[PDB]
């Protein structure tokens, strides 16, 4: 009997959990025993009134209730809640944005600009190709297996990262960009693009050598700056100005 | 060993450049310690408010950011032949920013602990706590502005 | 040099093109996010190039 | 506190004096090395030999009462522990034995140098070696005496509980005494090579 | 033809003229849409004077028997065998 | 950045100098960015303060 | 378990820096302090790449 | 450097400019931290009265304003070949404004938290709070005029 | 002894190298001590998250690694003929990293204690503990950045 009941017990629990909420909700409806034609209110998305009315009518026809069901919109003097029909593409960004504070009744939800600004603000702070690439692979580990992870307990292995599959992906691709524009796979600078500063062709064994501005490096910080005694000063001035301008 | 450029000139420059990060780091550390105790106390009871309540520790990290910026800016003016004026000004700027950041760290930590405690119970004290932290942070901002002025003229037409 | 204005022209053209050819469903999120990606990418490239446009300092080292 | 304010006054006056000398350009006038060279090495050597045995005795006595007071307190309930724990006192005063031995081997070294002659490398090295070898042995002896006293007190309390607990805690005392042995060996190694005050 | 994340969506407060007899089915389905809240009403009185107390207590009792099943089942050498099927239907099921 | 400073001949202001120099007084100390560039900005400053 | 990603990275990244050594690249080799022998260190780093390839093959036991 | 204008003259000016912002920052930080503890303790009962009881923190803000304005002006007064007299007087001004602001900050903090604690109960105590806050801020005000008038003579007819 | 390279120049560089490990070791010691006290004190009721709560001691070990790396590199900077200036910047780097690490270690200790106390009692506080420990670590990280930038600057254009 235990083996027999175990098959339906798991489904029976999730079935029976419904009515608790059902009666807790219709509790707010104020269905007095003497009163008939129960009257109540609730918050809906305005663009879904027609579809909810259609579904209710379809159910009433299915339920055989001869009396028609009607619904009317009140004068919304009281402030209604704020909603955002976010998809899985941006639900993480929206939730992280609203962690600070829920939006005003109809204001411009800050989630939408943050969707991009937060990953790029992180990336302009992060920089490296290699670390960003490994963390982008880590993000792919949850993005690709999103179907599997959705039905497996987050626990302490992922925890808040359960929703972070797409956030980490976008900050990783922006880390890629910041690497292209800071020119450092991990720390080491790459040299695909055209040669930058041309330090003088004749050099002594240990002489101090300056460089010549023969041109401008097209994409990002000039690889010639690497290893130089003025590299820290140049890069720091550069990215002070970059930070303040972007800010 | 020039009269205006003595050999012991860069000692003050190095001391200022370091102190600009030591004192700011101490202020930031005290701030984040007090704020973190507050966060732990409020979140063992009210776990959901954690991420929302993390801001005071950020504003403690402000002091460390300011120390880093002033330290590197002072360092870029260092030089073996630097005059005594340059070392003097770098020392003064480093002490000014570092101790302003230390005061900012004390303020940040104390009010962060108090505000975290308060927001644990009452919901809309958080905005006031944030603005008080804003004033505590802008204190370090005044310190940084002073340090930037000194460093800006640290090598202004120096003989 | 100083072709940053022309690069601004081309990225603005791409932004307007994507503005008009928004994805059919869920148009607003693509609309805002892609154009702001493009603009912010252009700005950060603009600084990282304009810094080296006419630099006031030169690399210096004692290494081969 | 008044004492802390005294420390603040000392720090501020020494800092301002140093800054005054540096700015007037006599930063060399505060010549620590010249002070080291001109002071007689006899003073360093003798301060070292005095302080090695002095600190060894201080640490020995400190550990002696630290162990003994708790030993007597625990012996009240059960005097079974007195004689069998006296080994802790023995291992506490072997530290004083070490101090006495280092003092006598150091006193093997003092003598009269030929007036201002031989006020040079050999005797200076011997003086500073004796000074901070004595400080090494004495301070290490003091600290291992503190440690062995604390461990002996704990051993007394534990012995008051069970007999075998005392012998399992005596290893803590042995480990503490290894510190004193190490202090003796390092003092001997870093002091012996300096010659006498020729 | 629906809103997006541009701002807060167009809110609405519509009035539920629920027939008394069909109330349970209407509430069940309306909750199934996953689309509506319920404005807090008649909350000025204590929680043990509601008209719904008896069904709440019997269903909570039922949940307690179900928990007792689960506890004794975990005590025994057997586990669940139909978790996947039930969750999928109730997760994002249609109006049916 | 836009002006090639050394070829331009006129002095190149510090990396982050001009505004903090301006904090003092409308009497621009030295090293003007452009013709009246350090001069007309007193209009912006007075606009902000009023 | 976790050694798979380490082996894959030790293939890819270690191989690209290996070849970039063998290319006598300025940013890596030829400096006053780094070893002057490009291909010499290239040989041992290629051997490291190969042993990480074998290590990745071993870690491929997840199937 | 001439004995009229010794090489070490800018040390006093730099340390004065630093110490001005340092001490005003410590005073303002103590005041804002302690009064903010008061605010956090009072608003859990009376959240609405935050926008009114906020004043003492702003007053510490004006103390910080005093510190920065004096520091920046006396900093503009620096220079390598500055006269010893200039350095001495500007050290005096910096220390004066800094420690006067520190005393004012202690007063603001103690008066502010005590007053906000009291005004949690009684509303009409608010005006007395504010009045005492001005009569304490006048301390930093006196420091402000003292430092400014020292700065005025810092280089007036100096040689 | 060159006028720019006095015989006592190695003092400052050597003391900087020493402090660079001394102060960070004191800070990491305090952090590890307080963190582990909290660990063993609060996980005794519920043990299974001992391995989870090990983390603040890992952060303190990272602080110790920070001190180790700065100390070994400034050792690499040491020499006999080094200029006074070089010794000054080595000293500055050592003090900067050491005292920033001491502040970071105080933060690690206090935050780790509070965090483990909360985490043993409530699980979701663990992530916030992680975040704060990261911040208390980036304090010492900023110190390391300052120190490494300094002791890189401590060698070029030196006569």
Write the layout of secondary structure elements.
This is part of a larger assembly, with three copies of chain A, three copies of chain B (159 residues), one copy of chain C (64 residues), one copy of chain D (198 residues) and one copy of chain G (63 residues).
Chain B lengths: L8 H37 L3 H4 L2 H21 L8 H38 L4 H27 L7
Chain C lengths: L3 H17 L6 H24 L14
Chain D lengths: L1 H23 L7 H7 L2 H37 L3 H27 L13 H41 L1 H30 L6
Helix pairs in contact in D: 3-4, 3-5, 4-5, 4-6, 5-6
PDB class: membrane protein
Keywords: membrane protein
Entry title: V-ATPase from Saccharomyces cerevisiae, State 2
Structure description:
Chain C: It is a multi-pass membrane protein. Chain C: It is found in: Vacuole membrane. Chain C: It comes from Saccharomyces cerevisiae (strain ATCC 204508 / S288c). Chain C: One of its GO terms (molecular function) is proton-transporting ATPase activity, rotational mechanism. Chain C: InterPro entries: ATPase_V0-cplx_e1/e2_su (IPR008389). The structure is cut from a larger assembly and holds 3 copies of chain A, 3 copies of chain B (159 residues), 1 copy of chain C (64 residues), 1 copy of chain D (198 residues) and 1 copy of chain G (63 residues). Chain A contains 8 helices and 2 strands; from the N terminus they run H-E-H-E-H-H-H-H-H-H. With 247 residues, chain A is mostly helical. In chain A, helix 4 crosses helix 7 (165-182). Chain A is elongated and about 105 Å long. With 159 residues, chain B is mostly helical. Helix content of chain B is 80%, strand content 0%. Chain B has helices at residues 9-45, 49-52, 55-75, 84-121, 126-152. In chain B, helix 1 (9-45) runs antiparallel to helix 3 (55-75) and helix 4 packs antiparallel against helix 5 (126-152). Chain B starts with 8 loop residues before the first helix and ends in a 7-residue tail after the last helix. Chain C has one domain. Chain C is built from 2 helices and no strands. Chain C is elongated. The two termini of chain C are 29 Å apart. Chain G has 63 residues and is mainly alpha-helical. Chain G has one domain. Helix content of chain G is 67%, strand content 0%. Chains A and E meet through helix 1, strand 1, helix 2 and strand 2 of A and strand 1, helix 1, helix 2 and helix 3 of E.
